[PDB]
Write a protein that binds this ligand. Sequence first.
Ligand SMILES: [Mg+2]
Ligand SMILES: [Mg+2]
Ligand SMILES: [Mg+2]
Ligand SMILES: [Mg+2]
Ligand SMILES: [Mg+2]
Ligand SMILES: [Mg+2]
Ligand SMILES: [Mg+2]
Ligand SMILES: [Mg+2]
Ligand SMILES: [Mg+2]
Ligand SMILES: [Mg+2]
Ligand SMILES: [Mg+2]
Ligand SMILES: [Zn+2]
Lengths: 144, 37, 216, 176
Amino acid sequence: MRQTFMANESNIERKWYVIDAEGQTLGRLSSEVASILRGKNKVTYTPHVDTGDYVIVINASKIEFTGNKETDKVYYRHSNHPGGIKSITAGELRRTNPERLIENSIKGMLPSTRLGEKQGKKLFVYGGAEHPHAAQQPENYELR
Amino acid sequence: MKVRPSVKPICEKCKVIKRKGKVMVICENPKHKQRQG
Amino acid sequence: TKGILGRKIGMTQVFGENGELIPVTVVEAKENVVLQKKTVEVDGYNAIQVGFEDKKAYKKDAKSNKYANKPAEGHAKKADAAPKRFIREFRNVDVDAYEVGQEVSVDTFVAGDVIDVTGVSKGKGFQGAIKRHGQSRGPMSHGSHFHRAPGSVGMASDASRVFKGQKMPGRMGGNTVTVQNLEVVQVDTENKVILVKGNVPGPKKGLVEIRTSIKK
Amino acid sequence: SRVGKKIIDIPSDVTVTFDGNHVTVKGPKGELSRTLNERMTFKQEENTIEVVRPSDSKEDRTNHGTTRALLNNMVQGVSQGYVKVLELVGVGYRAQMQGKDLILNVGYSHPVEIKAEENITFSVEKNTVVKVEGISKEQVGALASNIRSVRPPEPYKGKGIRYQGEYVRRKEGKTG
RNA sequence: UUGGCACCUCGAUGUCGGCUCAUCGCAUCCUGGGGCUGUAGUCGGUCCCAAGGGUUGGGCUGUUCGCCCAUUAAAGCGGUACGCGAGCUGGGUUCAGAACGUCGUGAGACAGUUCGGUCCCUAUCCGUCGUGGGCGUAGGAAAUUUGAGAGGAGCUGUCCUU
RNA sequence: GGGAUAAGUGCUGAAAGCAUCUAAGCAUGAAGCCCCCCUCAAGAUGAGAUUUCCCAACUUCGGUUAUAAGAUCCCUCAAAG
Ligand SMILES: [Mg+2]
Ligand SMILES: [Mg+2]
Ligand SMILES: [Mg+2]
Ligand SMILES: [Mg+2]
Ligand SMILES: [Mg+2]
Ligand SMILES: [Mg+2]
Ligand SMILES: [Mg+2]
Ligand SMILES: [Mg+2]
Ligand SMILES: [Mg+2]
Ligand SMILES: [Mg+2]
Ligand SMILES: [Mg+2]
Ligand SMILES: [Zn+2]
């Protein structure tokens, strides 16, 4: 007998969290944030609807790497023009666009589906210690 | 500079060192400068 | 660093101090007025907006761009100026040296100033690869059936596609072009004209922007 | 690490004060401040200092040695200072002082100007002996190296700028 | 590269060279930066970094190669169906004619030669180059704009002076 | 011209009392890398910014309406096609 609860927009409640990148390892913070965005921490998780929460990441500029990734982890992209490969090291990207660094790390951990894109839109990243979303009244969230 | 897979002393004054992950020989004789590669 | 807007009148020549023949373009740059002052505080960057060539005042049933519409009339009236035909920003000047509503006379430039001139190049319409991209023709004889065609557009199975940037027939000209390091040969304040050494982009009557040369 | 274990003598006129990792040494000639390895402890005796490493790991031994050497260098720099002497070889190769800066004429079509830095003094003797004096051993070495690299010694006649005690290998020039 | 194998294609995957258009690798021809030299200097030798750009006209031959003439900073080596024939040519080469040498009794034959000899196609889709319309961008509009991104450019001689 | 680098060149420096460009630390160093220069660019759906313009009646009171600012049809044209 079919009795499985299914979440839908009428009964989904999305909260706002703030997570501090400072002193956190890029990938580990990223995987936990991705779970939050997908709603994997809710008992009402329902795969075909977004049951996840909003996440603000602050102090992205203080995210940290292990090993020699600062100079040796290289992000490549292609402009779809012949020879159009462009690269930037993880350290340089942390210096010049830490927000993008975190955003790409997290979004690489979400499904490439319409729903996954939508869920990734609930992430807001800031290099410094401030965010402009006091109106959403976000709660501090402790990793792990 | 000698760049070659076989880096080793050529005279008794040659000194095997390691710089930036590379085996090298430094010597008073410049001919004996070697870098593994 | 200085800036002004004018219309291209046409080309002529002048004889220099040693009798050298100097080709010149005549640029009429009357009726330049500073309409707006943009700042990092308000706009996020510093620049002066200059309006050039008075157009007619607003009227009820206007049918052409000759008559300023109400938004434009309000914008210019805020600067206390008549509405203008062309409006462009100069970021290369010091905003503190200008006041809104101020005139920008051709005398801002002096003979010998090195300048960059920007315009929209003449349009040519739909053009083929020989003209548009300067490619070589095929043979005109020896049995050829290849004269003005563009030639091979790719290779083979690798890559089974044409790469972006392939040069092909299409619309030609009508592009923004900057010519660097021209010279102000002469300034005629009575006629409101600047004689620029050499040639500049665009048809006659075309809008041209003159700035202090960026390279120095 | 014997170098690490070795104790540092403090002259009476030199005062060493620690602020966590950061340390600063004052003396007759000047003040030197720097941040040392955070895992090294300091036994600050009234007349002497000792460096203590927590473990015997490779990293601890290496950093113990370098920390002791650096602190000793700071103390001796404030006390006695450091000097490096270069000399000019070659006819027409000369040096002189344009105030505090040093201008060298060494076989180039232009003179070479070396701007003096804070805590550093240049002195020219006989127009052919430059000497760099400072409290920072590192800074003295760096500036002496720059002066030498303006035109280092060449092997066929020894011409150029050398450290006064430097040994310059010599090669025979023209041969049949 | 010469081959080996015979796995896709024989209800067809057009084959050499050239032309047009390129594009990529770097094991770098020039130019830039270096170490060693049996580097005096001017030149060189050898090795390392480096792919940004640049890297010629002619004689002969179907030729690719190659030799030669004259230049150049240099006249790089390779991949892309030995790039590119629904983009071009069609000189070579493997249809029918004819002939020589040769082989064959003969019909004929020869990775021997010789003269001659039909290169079709109105672009549906992706791709590419241009150019419009819709809606979106939480009111409807006119102008001026930031620049996330993307594209372009990137070469070199000689002479004077020191 | 600027920033960061390659091969290199070094300073200080221990592990390893010496030596040592390297481990910590600090310099310097290519037509190359990121910029500087030129062009496009907010369908950048993350759709940004500034200035100026328009602004009422009727409503089953959710909403609607022709109109406003504005832009077009049509027409005379060219620097555009
Ligand atoms: Mg050997
Ligand atoms: Mg031709
Ligand atoms: Mg024809
Ligand atoms: Mg078939
Ligand atoms: Mg290489
Ligand atoms: Mg002939
Ligand atoms: Mg082929
Ligand atoms: Mg084809
Ligand atoms: Mg034929
Ligand atoms: Mg026959
Ligand atoms: Mg017979
Ligand atoms: Zn030796």
